[PDB]
Amino acid sequence: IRTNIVTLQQKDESTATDMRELLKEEPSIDFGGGNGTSQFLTLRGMGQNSVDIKVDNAYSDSQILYHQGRFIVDPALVKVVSVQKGAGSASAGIGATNGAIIAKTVDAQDLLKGLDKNWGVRLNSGFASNEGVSYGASVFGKEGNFDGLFSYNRNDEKEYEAGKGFRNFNGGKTVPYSALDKRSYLAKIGTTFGDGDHRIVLSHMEDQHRGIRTVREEFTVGDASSRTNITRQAPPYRETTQSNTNLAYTGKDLGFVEKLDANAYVLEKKRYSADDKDNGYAGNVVGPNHTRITTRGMNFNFDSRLAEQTLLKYGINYRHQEIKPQAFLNGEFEISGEKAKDKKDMDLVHSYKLSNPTKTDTGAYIEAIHELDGFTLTGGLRYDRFKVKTHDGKTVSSSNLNPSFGVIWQPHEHWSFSSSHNYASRSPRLYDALQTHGKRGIISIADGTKAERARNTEIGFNYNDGTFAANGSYFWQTIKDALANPQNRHVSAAVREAVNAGYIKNHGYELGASYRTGGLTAKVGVSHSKPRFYDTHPKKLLSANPEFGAQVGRAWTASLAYRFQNPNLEIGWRGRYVQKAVGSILVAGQKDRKLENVVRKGFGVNDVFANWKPLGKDTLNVNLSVNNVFNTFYYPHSQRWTNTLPGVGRDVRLGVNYKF
Ligand SMILES: [Fe+3]
């Protein structure tokens, strides 16, 4: 009945092989068009510059390049995915100025669900009309106090075709260079000891998109006239990869500490180009190019019980980030054609000895939870410190004290009410990994620049009597000292700096209602937001790039589904409709290369779907779907407004999964 979370068993009844399709019933997240990292993400209209994907509680905030979205995990690795729309209190961790996607990798215990034994094999296959094929396999089990798992998954997707009316630069229906060969695996071993009180989990996960991909992944190929032509978009072979090595600890009843949760991880993002020759951003490195972002981090979270219903929570977060290119290239630095200035400038850039940019985030927090007779009060405090070192070796540091509090009030067994007022900070992000080389100039940080500081406020209610269900939230957010890294990535300027450049206001709401009577499930959801960026700098420093957000149109979703008892079988309808949207995220208007009058056409997608459980149980699903049944030609709103990447046209899908 809840659209904000999807569980594993739910996903086994589903035919989708990426997050955007998996979460399409949740209205306050929106995805852009295109495949893999073509996709930008928004939460309440706010972009990946602000919203993190945390998997097993490991996450970074750096990007590869402003023309592509931050990597979004492959759902076949996860036992559960949540959207926390809100933020969270003092113990949410580093940078939680907005909500997040939260995901946890799958477990032996999870894969074992269907079965009457301690070991197992899983096989899946999928076929998609528009257009691709997927298969994988998984082995897992538990013995003595150990659990272990190995999973392999591959989704080979061809170029997809848009809905009725869209044409290619060469007259065809498909989206050029939208093919990716997607591979992922997971190795996991865990142990439970200390008379069942202590648990250790060690895991390694790879997730790799490989294919023929444009310079700027957010665009395809337009005709020879447009800035988007075949030699300007210049598609070589590329491999983009997320990796994650995680060590997780969990203790209960450890003296005066009631619960301890700890984790240490390494997180790598790599970009491999076969030939970056015709890619200016990467510096036209001829042949093989490798860019890497490494994130090391550590979290310790403690809970001590102070009275029968009063918990004290305290802990530490440390995160280190390192951008690491193949090689610096500020040597090749060049300005086009007072130009006396240019010359003193090329000179400057050439004499610079560049090094790997780094960012350390440290946090400590304390939080109290007091609960009495259906009324819960949470109050809390964080100290956030950061250190940023740019590729020019310059170091800037700041710290903040962040208070937060909230209440949950439950007067009655069907109803509950919540609100909160949280402060949180986010430290400047490092400039695009792919430009770190310096060819286009030095990217520094001005003296004394501060963390963006967010004030989040919200109220909501929740109602559920086993048959009707309903939920609502209203939220407000101010972000002060919004950071702007230097926005123009074309153009060669000698020294430019990240600064506090203005402030951000956003407000809006979501509603959900549902009805479930033996077999029949009905759901509706609506969500609307209003992110607005204000420049407080003479130079208007803020930008309308999708990484930041977009004014999405009011989004409505709905589904209707019936589960039969004979056979075990569910048929369903699902739709997402988004209304006409008007306006930039920027108050001062956004501009071409001149003032753009932004309007995003509205559109409606319908899907039908089926899930057939032939053995009367969860070990074999045969699923069938038809997505975008009317073959609606449209463009998602979470992306630029000039007609970039369409949403997939009618797609038909059949997937099977089988544990035994
Ligand atoms: Fe560009």
Numbering used by the authors: 67 to 403, 421 to 676, 679 to 745
Task: Give the authors' words.
The FrpB F3-3 coordinates were then used to solve the structure of the FrpB F5-1 variant, which is a monoclinic crystal form with a monomer in the asymmetric unit. Solution of the FrpB F5-1 monoclinic crystal structure revealed the presence of a peak of high electron density, characteristic of a bound ion, coordinated by residues from the barrel and plug domain. This observation led us to repeat the data collection for an FrpB F5-1 crystal, but presoaking with iron before freezing. Data were then collected at high and low energies, the latter tuned to measure the anomalous diffraction from the bound iron atom. The highest peak in the anomalous difference map, at 11.2σ, coincided with the bound ion. The next highest peak in the map was at 4.5σ, demonstrating that this is a unique and specific binding site. A fifth coordination site is provided by an imidazole molecule, which was present in the crystallization medium. A comparison of the FrpB F5-1 variant structures in the Fe-bound and unbound (apoprotein) states revealed two specific structural changes which apparently occurred on binding of Fe. First, portions of loops 3 and 8 were absent from electron density maps for the apoprotein form, but were structured in the Fe-bound state. In the case of the Fe-bound FrpB structure, however, traceable electron density did not start until Ala67, and residues 67–71 adopt a different conformation.
